[PDB]
Structure formats: C-alpha cells, structure tokens
C-alpha cells in the first residue's frame, strides 16, 4: 500500500496550509522510501525546516536541500547519493513529484513538485509521487516564484510527516 505524506507549508514563517502526497512505492520503492523517511525525520534529519528555494511559475517548485556534514545539496537515507531506480513513471501533469539531480545517479534529497506537464524531463528524472490534496497550496506557492526561480517570500516546510 502506497504511503501518504504531508508538508505543512509556511510563507515568511506564517502557516498557509497542508499538502499531501501519494508516494508510488509500488513502482519506485527505494525512491519513495527515501522521501517518506526524510518527511518523518526518523533518521535524525530530513525536510522539516527546509525551504522551496527555486520556484518557476508555469514549471515547478523545487526544494529539499539542507546542510549536512561532508558535502552539499542534501543527502538521502542510503548515503550522499543513490541510483536512478527506474524511469517507468512519466511527468504527466501538475502535482507530479520527481527527483532533482546533477545528472545520472545523483539522487539525494532534492525534489520538485510540477505545476505543468514537463515531458522534456522524462527519462532523466525519477518520478515517484503525486500531490493528493492541497494543490491549491502548491498553486499559492507558485505565485511567489519568478522566471529565474527566486522567490519573493520565503517558502518553508514548517512541518512534515506521514499520514
């Protein structure tokens, strides 16, 4: 059974509301599990307090970075990086949850929430979940972005976990 997770989103420290995601563990269990564990924080680190640092209206919201010892960009629960598990799932429309990377097999913690169909990224980014409720929150976040990705207010994950 696919796990559900939630982010409680804030804008300049003010809670806006909740977004929940279905994680497609039935298709990419390793990638889903990394995201789940970083959402609950059960390994001692994860998305809580993290921020959406690059938001491009019409495209997507990217976050999941946090500082760690011995490098940069985030770490996964399996190490500094892990393999592209598979590319079964495509970027089919708004709400899609998919992994940011720095090329092949460099998955960590960073991810993005699509606000459009992003077909050009199929085969290069592992899709692994989808917004379940609170797309209105993601649409509200999206307005705080810009063409170059800079946000006009600070968008954070005030809290997160599993439902």
């Amino acid at each position: 059974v696919n796990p559900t997770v939630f982010f409680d989103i804030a804008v300049d420290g003010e809670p806006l509301g909740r977004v929940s995601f279905e994680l497609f563990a039935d298709k990419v269990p390793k990638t889903a599990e990394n995201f789940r564990a970083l959402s609950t924080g059960e390994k001692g680190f994860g998305y809580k307090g993290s921020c959406f640092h690059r938001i491009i209206p019409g495209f997507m919201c990217q976050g999941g970075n946090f500082t760690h010892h011995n490098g940069t960009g985030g770490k996964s629960i399996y190490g500094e990086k892990f393999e592209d598990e598979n590319f079964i799932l495509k970027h089919t429309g708004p709400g899609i949850l998919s992994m940011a990377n720095a090329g092949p097999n460099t998955n960590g913690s960073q991810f993005f929430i699509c606000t459009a169909k992003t077909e050009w990224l199929d085969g290069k980014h592992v899709v692994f979940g989808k917004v379940k409720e609170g797309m209105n929150i993601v649409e509200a976040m999206e307005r705080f972005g810009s063409r170059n990705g800079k946000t006009s207010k600070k968008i954070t994950i005030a809290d997160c976990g599993q439902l």
């Binding site: 690059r54 990217q62 990377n101 720095a102 090329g103 960073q110 993005f112 050009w120």
Partner: peptide
Amino acid sequence: XLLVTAGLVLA
C-alpha cells in the same frame, strides 16, 4: 531553459 538540477543550474 527549464531544468531541475542540484548545483550547476542551466538555462
């Protein structure tokens, strides 16, 4: 362009 990378962000 429209990419989602982690470090060397391209156009």
